[PDB]
Design an enzyme around this catalytic site. Structure first.
Site, PDB file in Angstrom:
ATOM      1  N   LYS A 162       0.811  -1.214   0.000  1.00  0.00           N
ATOM      2  CA  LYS A 162       0.000   0.000   0.000  1.00  0.00           C
ATOM      3  C   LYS A 162       0.847   1.267   0.000  1.00  0.00           C
ATOM      4  O   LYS A 162       0.345   2.344  -0.348  1.00  0.00           O
ATOM      5  CB  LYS A 162      -0.939   0.002   1.207  1.00  0.00           C
ATOM      6  CG  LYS A 162      -2.038   1.065   1.138  1.00  0.00           C
ATOM      7  CD  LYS A 162      -2.930   1.000   2.367  1.00  0.00           C
ATOM      8  CE  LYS A 162      -4.075   2.000   2.275  1.00  0.00           C
ATOM      9  NZ  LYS A 162      -3.577   3.403   2.242  1.00  0.00           N
ATOM     10  N   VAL A 215      -1.656   1.280  -5.324  1.00  0.00           N
ATOM     11  CA  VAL A 215      -2.106   0.229  -4.419  1.00  0.00           C
ATOM     12  C   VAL A 215      -2.812   0.903  -3.251  1.00  0.00           C
ATOM     13  O   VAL A 215      -2.190   1.658  -2.497  1.00  0.00           O
ATOM     14  CB  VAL A 215      -0.938  -0.636  -3.914  1.00  0.00           C
ATOM     15  CG1 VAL A 215      -1.459  -1.706  -2.978  1.00  0.00           C
ATOM     16  CG2 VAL A 215      -0.158  -1.267  -5.084  1.00  0.00           C
ATOM     17  N   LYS A 237      -6.312  -7.709  -0.527  1.00  0.00           N
ATOM     18  CA  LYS A 237      -6.193  -8.880  -1.393  1.00  0.00           C
ATOM     19  C   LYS A 237      -4.779  -9.438  -1.372  1.00  0.00           C
ATOM     20  O   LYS A 237      -4.581 -10.658  -1.429  1.00  0.00           O
ATOM     21  CB  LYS A 237      -6.625  -8.514  -2.817  1.00  0.00           C
ATOM     22  CG  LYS A 237      -8.124  -8.268  -2.921  1.00  0.00           C
ATOM     23  CD  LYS A 237      -8.555  -7.951  -4.346  1.00  0.00           C
ATOM     24  CE  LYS A 237     -10.069  -7.987  -4.501  1.00  0.00           C
ATOM     25  NZ  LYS A 237     -10.776  -7.075  -3.544  1.00  0.00           N
ATOM     26  N   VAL A 246     -10.248 -13.866 -28.477  1.00  0.00           N
ATOM     27  CA  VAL A 246     -10.265 -13.753 -29.932  1.00  0.00           C
ATOM     28  C   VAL A 246     -10.162 -12.286 -30.328  1.00  0.00           C
ATOM     29  O   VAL A 246     -10.911 -11.447 -29.813  1.00  0.00           O
ATOM     30  CB  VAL A 246     -11.548 -14.377 -30.501  1.00  0.00           C
ATOM     31  CG1 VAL A 246     -11.555 -14.266 -32.011  1.00  0.00           C
ATOM     32  CG2 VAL A 246     -11.678 -15.815 -30.045  1.00  0.00           C
ATOM     33  N   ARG A 253      11.651  -1.678 -27.348  1.00  0.00           N
ATOM     34  CA  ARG A 253      12.045  -1.704 -25.942  1.00  0.00           C
ATOM     35  C   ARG A 253      13.022  -2.830 -25.620  1.00  0.00           C
ATOM     36  O   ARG A 253      13.361  -3.021 -24.447  1.00  0.00           O
ATOM     37  CB  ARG A 253      10.807  -1.828 -25.049  1.00  0.00           C
ATOM     38  CG  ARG A 253       9.718  -0.793 -25.365  1.00  0.00           C
ATOM     39  CD  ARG A 253       8.738  -0.648 -24.183  1.00  0.00           C
ATOM     40  NE  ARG A 253       8.045  -1.900 -23.898  1.00  0.00           N
ATOM     41  CZ  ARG A 253       6.944  -2.313 -24.517  1.00  0.00           C
ATOM     42  NH1 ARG A 253       6.380  -1.565 -25.463  1.00  0.00           N
ATOM     43  NH2 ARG A 253       6.394  -3.479 -24.174  1.00  0.00           N
ATOM     44  N   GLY A 307       4.634  -9.836 -28.724  1.00  0.00           N
ATOM     45  CA  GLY A 307       3.317 -10.346 -29.055  1.00  0.00           C
ATOM     46  C   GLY A 307       2.945 -10.131 -30.508  1.00  0.00           C
ATOM     47  O   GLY A 307       2.127 -10.876 -31.053  1.00  0.00           O
ATOM     48  N   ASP A 308       3.514  -9.108 -31.148  1.00  0.00           N
ATOM     49  CA  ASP A 308       3.216  -8.799 -32.546  1.00  0.00           C
ATOM     50  C   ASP A 308       4.301  -7.862 -33.063  1.00  0.00           C
ATOM     51  O   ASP A 308       5.252  -7.532 -32.346  1.00  0.00           O
ATOM     52  CB  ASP A 308       1.814  -8.197 -32.715  1.00  0.00           C
ATOM     53  CG  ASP A 308       1.705  -6.748 -32.211  1.00  0.00           C
ATOM     54  OD1 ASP A 308       2.608  -6.246 -31.516  1.00  0.00           O
ATOM     55  OD2 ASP A 308       0.680  -6.124 -32.521  1.00  0.00           O
ATOM     56  N   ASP A 311       4.960  -4.065 -34.599  1.00  0.00           N
ATOM     57  CA  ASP A 311       4.449  -2.701 -34.710  1.00  0.00           C
ATOM     58  C   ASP A 311       5.415  -1.887 -35.557  1.00  0.00           C
ATOM     59  O   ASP A 311       6.591  -1.759 -35.201  1.00  0.00           O
ATOM     60  CB  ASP A 311       4.314  -2.078 -33.319  1.00  0.00           C
ATOM     61  CG  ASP A 311       3.417  -2.888 -32.434  1.00  0.00           C
ATOM     62  OD1 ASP A 311       2.255  -2.994 -32.821  1.00  0.00           O
ATOM     63  OD2 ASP A 311       3.864  -3.476 -31.423  1.00  0.00           O
ATOM     64  N   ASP A 350       0.872  -4.450 -37.165  1.00  0.00           N
ATOM     65  CA  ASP A 350       0.255  -3.134 -37.215  1.00  0.00           C
ATOM     66  C   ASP A 350       1.214  -2.183 -37.905  1.00  0.00           C
ATOM     67  O   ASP A 350       2.415  -2.201 -37.622  1.00  0.00           O
ATOM     68  CB  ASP A 350      -0.041  -2.624 -35.810  1.00  0.00           C
ATOM     69  CG  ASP A 350      -1.090  -3.460 -35.097  1.00  0.00           C
ATOM     70  OD1 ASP A 350      -2.037  -3.925 -35.749  1.00  0.00           O
ATOM     71  OD2 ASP A 350      -0.985  -3.629 -33.882  1.00  0.00           O
TER      72      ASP A 350
HETATM   73 MG   LIG Z   1       3.153  -4.826 -30.133  1.00  0.00          MG
HETATM   74 NA    NA Z   2     -10.636  -9.797 -28.048  1.00  0.00          NA
HETATM   75 NA    NA Z   3       0.501  -4.079 -32.316  1.00  0.00          NA
HETATM   76 NA    NA Z   4      -0.601   3.445  -2.242  1.00  0.00          NA
END
Ligand SMILES: [Mg+2]
Ligand code: NA
Ligand code: NA
Ligand code: NA
Ligand SMILES: [Cl-]
Ligand SMILES: [Cl-]
Ligand SMILES: [Cl-]
Ligand SMILES: [Mg+2]
EC number: 2.7.7.7
Length: 326
Positions: free
Chosen positions: A51, A56, A63, A94, A174, A180-181, A183, A247
DNA sequence: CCGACGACGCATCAGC
DNA sequence: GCTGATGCGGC
DNA sequence: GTCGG
């Protein structure tokens, strides 16, 4: 991954709130907390310790205490056992199915992968391509393959017009070991904020990549943004590579630095930086940084000649792309 | 307590 | 056809 | 769900 259990729990809660509850601010709250905890350099020992981190609060602190004591979260355990929630969450995996379409399908009895295949006629074009490649789009792209994809895109763009510049952004820029893909930021001197001196600038690139069978499908396509599917070529007798999401964003050439800051991300980094800009009296999009007036209305674009110029305006020390993976 | 929470391109739909 | 709202996606 | 004011 000192705190991978906690950040996984928060990510699962975020996804529940976005996909099931349709509570986008809760989704963003959980993602921000997961991101601040992910970069915290100690193994968290209590919710009170967590916290202290920004984003947070009391509820996530509680939690984290439950998760630390038991290794589980009863709230997530119950969500996991709910058929309707689990099915809605699955369908949003999807591409093109969001929370609204997922709930509508589940309400019509469409709640599995076989159900979707059977009901292909109820899908729009984007959703149909997302289903076709569901398995492939779940796979990460090793950076070695990203380098092969970069070589193809940059060389094919060069063949169309030597004055295009294509820059691969996203997690690749980066420094990620997998993406993931792919760009791709694109510029051409004929497209600036002042004028468009050539039509079809993006189209010509997309068409060339289709002609060499690199781009295989289109999810959406306009004058400045292409979202689609591509595939590395494979050698004789070799299994084919998975199909990959690509993309391509055409950005006015004089606005390259705002564009490459945007397209490098991460998404949470952009949200944090744009939020900080607001607190500093500026607004940042992929084109410009503008000052806000006393009324809160955006003024004229400020001069920008480097990514670092944008950090300087909002009084942030420069962060290299590899330190933007929030 | 309460407003704010980043910014926007493309697809699809309602309403005209 | 257009405009505006919404869904979904991108970082 | 969190936070600044
Ligand atoms: Mg990407
Ligand atoms: Na989706
Ligand atoms: Na992308
Ligand atoms: Na905080
Ligand atoms: Cl759990
Ligand atoms: Cl710029
Ligand atoms: Cl702008
Ligand atoms: Mg992403």
């Amino acid at each position: 991954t000192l705190n991978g259990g906690i950040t996984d729990m928060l990510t699962e809660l975020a996804n529940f709130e976005k996909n099931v509850s349709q509570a986008i601010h809760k989704y963003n709250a959980y993602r921000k907390a997961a991101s601040v905890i992910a970069k915290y350099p100690h193994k968290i020992k209590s919710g009170a310790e967590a916290k202290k981190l920004p984003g947070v609060g009391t509820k996530i602190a509680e939690k984290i205490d439950e998760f630390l004591a038991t290794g589980k979260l009863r709230k997530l355990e119950k969500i996991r056992q709910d058929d309707t929630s689990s099915s809605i969450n699955f369908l949003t995996r999807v591409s093109g199915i969001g929370p609204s379409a997922a709930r509508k399908f589940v309400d019509e009895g469409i709640k599995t992968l076989e159900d979707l295949r059977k009901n292909e006629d109820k899908l729009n074009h984007h959703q149909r391509i997302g289903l076709k490649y569901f398995g492939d789009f779940e796979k990460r792209i090793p950076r070695e393959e990203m380098l092969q994809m970069q070589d193809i895109v940059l060389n094919e763009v060069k063949k169309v017009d030597s004055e295009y510049i294509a820059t691969v952004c996203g997690s690749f820029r980066r420094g990620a070991e997998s993406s993931g893909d792919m760009d791709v930021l694109l510029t051409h001197p004929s497209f600036t904020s002042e004028s468009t001196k050539q039509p079809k600038l993006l189209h010509q690139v997309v068409e060339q990549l289709q002609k060499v069978h690199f781009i295989t499908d289109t999810l959406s396509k306009g004058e400045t943004k292409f979202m689609g599917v591509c595939q590395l070529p494979s050698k004789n007798d070799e299994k084919e590579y998975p199909h990959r999401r690509i993309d391509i964003r055409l950005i006015p050439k004089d606005q390259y630095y705002c564009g490459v800051l945007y397209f490098t991300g991460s998404d949470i980094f952009n949200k944090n930086m744009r939020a900080h800009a607001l607190e500093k009296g500026f607004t940042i999009n992929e084109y410009t940084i503008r000052p806000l007036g006393v009324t809160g209305v955006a003024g004229e674009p400020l001069p920008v000649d480097s990514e670092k110029d944008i950090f300087d305006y909002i009084q942030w020390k420069y962060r290299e792309p590899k330190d933007r993976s929030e």
